[PDB]
Point group: C2
């Protein structure tokens, strides 16, 4: 079963860590700080890892029921279900329900409700809401998160969905940090079942990211969210489940009109890309360009500089 | 060879609104025409109507807010293509790709990020609504007007609309999923439309992939039905497998037990028919999915569903 990539331009790709299109490619200087995102994690033979699930509309979304309120800024207690509406099992071998945000910050969007049972069944409402992943009530692994909402008088103990729109720094200092994992079980607890950290370990190699500039709700944050591989690749590997023949798939970024290769990169078995380059660099590439699978190589392959 | 992706209903996205599929539904043939413009794709991978590839593009807008008017639909948004490129109104499409294909109100959020001289990089976001009944809803001409919640915190800057749900308007403009809006002005016909779809065989009805999308008040069920899910569209676009006949016979299978539950006709132009009479929400096991069986033709006689 031969390995392959979907043929898609950057504007035809979705960020696997936030539900927006990809804007550009970026390679980052290797620093001390570790890359360990939990969404957008998938092996080349199609094993989803961390909190990764298949739907763009599941990324940083929540589903469940609002069951209580507390006298705290994170006021409304949302008891979570899996995004498909099935019962969430906290003893499952995942860091958190699939789709949970994998960064520290505030996700802003909207909550919507639709009543079931005895109390005005079928009645609906929606409003602006925020989820702080710094909150001591952000404990999705245990089965709940607390919401901040704009109108505390129009919100009921009913089935609720959170739809994400963007991110921001909190307004009491706590900054948006895309590479800092939240505490999925709250303060004084350690995360479990994590997709492993990723780093280049070949001299002169750096990670290559698919970058999006997501919306923000005030101030000057650039909204940068970088993912290892786009959601469409994850979807493709899941379908194909092609066995991986070595630790590294050599891939070429090609211009399909002119037919030429623009640069090459290493796509590692565990689902991330490295290139031979030194320094932060937003890539300058033609809009019609896309990656294509060349061959199976190994860790020691020496990339042409990019 | 032609094929379908292997995905359960909870692993599929509605091609007409960016939410998961909840269920399958077959509808009684009525007089009203089914002619949706999102979620349109041939089996050999030709996207039609206002269809584009990204779930996050469905019912989204991108552009620049350039003026306001003393009307309920106050803020004039000049549209770009969803990738940020310049929208060309003379292109052979009904409207910019991703434009909503129903009459009603789409609610969600607008967000801005300044460029140029005036506080570049400054951002803001809030609740907003797009009425597709509005006389200022003219996406084919290159603009729509937005209703927003805070008229004092909104600038003439690059803007994105992110949809969350739908609703009936007030004052007698209901949410009608099968009524196309006027993509240009009142009194102008829509152009370059994906064609109407209907069963042509006696005893056959359309089969839909159904979602119950969020609503922002009242009792509307939020029903949005699509012909084929977004993942199938994405798959046909990739494969571009030449279609060998007008109809692909597909079987809904339970992969655990291995048995076929029913069969259906997947037509070349990208819609499904089944042999059934009456509105019926299907009750099928959660692990079920369609699989391609063979190329047949229009005259194939389906086993009753």
């Amino acid at each position: 079963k031969p390995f392959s990539l979907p043929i898609l331009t950057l504007s035809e790709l979705t960020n696997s860590r936030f539900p927006v299109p990809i804007d550009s490619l970026f390679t980052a200087q290797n620093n001390v700080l570790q890359v360990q995102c939990q969404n957008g994690r998938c092996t080349l033979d199609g094993e989803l890892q961390g909190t990764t699930q298949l739907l763009p509309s599941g990324i940083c979304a929540f589903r469940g029921r609002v069951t209580a309120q507390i006298n705290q800024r994170d006021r409304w207690h949302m008891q979570l279900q899996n995004l498909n509406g099935t019962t969430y099992d906290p003893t499952d071998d995942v860091p958190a329900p699939l789709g949970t945000p994998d960064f520290k910050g505030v996700v802003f969007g909207m909550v919507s409700q639709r009543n079931v049972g005895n109390d005005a069944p079928g009645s609906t409402r929606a409003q602006q809401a925020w989820v702080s992943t710094y909150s001591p009530q952000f404990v999705p692994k245990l089965g709940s998160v607390n919401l901040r909402i704009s109108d505390n008088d129009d919100f009921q103990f009913q089935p609720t969905k959170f739809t994400p729109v963007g991110v921001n720094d909190d307004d009491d200092g706590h900054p948006f940090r895309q590479w800092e994992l939240p505490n999925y079980s709250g303060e004084l607890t350690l995360n479990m079942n994590l997709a492993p950290p990723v780093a280049p370990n070949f001299p002169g190699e750096q990670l290559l990211f698919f970058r999006s500039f997501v919306p923000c709700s005030g101030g000057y944050n650039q909204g940068i969210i970088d993912c290892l591989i786009p959601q469409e690749w994850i979807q493709h590997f899941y379908q194909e489940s092609a066995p991986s023949q070595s630790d590294v798939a050599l891939i070429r970024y090609v211009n399909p009109d002119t037919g030429r290769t623009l640069f090459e990169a290493k796509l590692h078995r565990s689902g991330y890309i490295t290139v031979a380059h030194s320094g932060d660099y937003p890539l300058v590439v033609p809009a019609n360009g896309h990656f294509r699978f060349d061959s199976w190589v190994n860790q020691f392959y020496s990339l042409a500089p990019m």
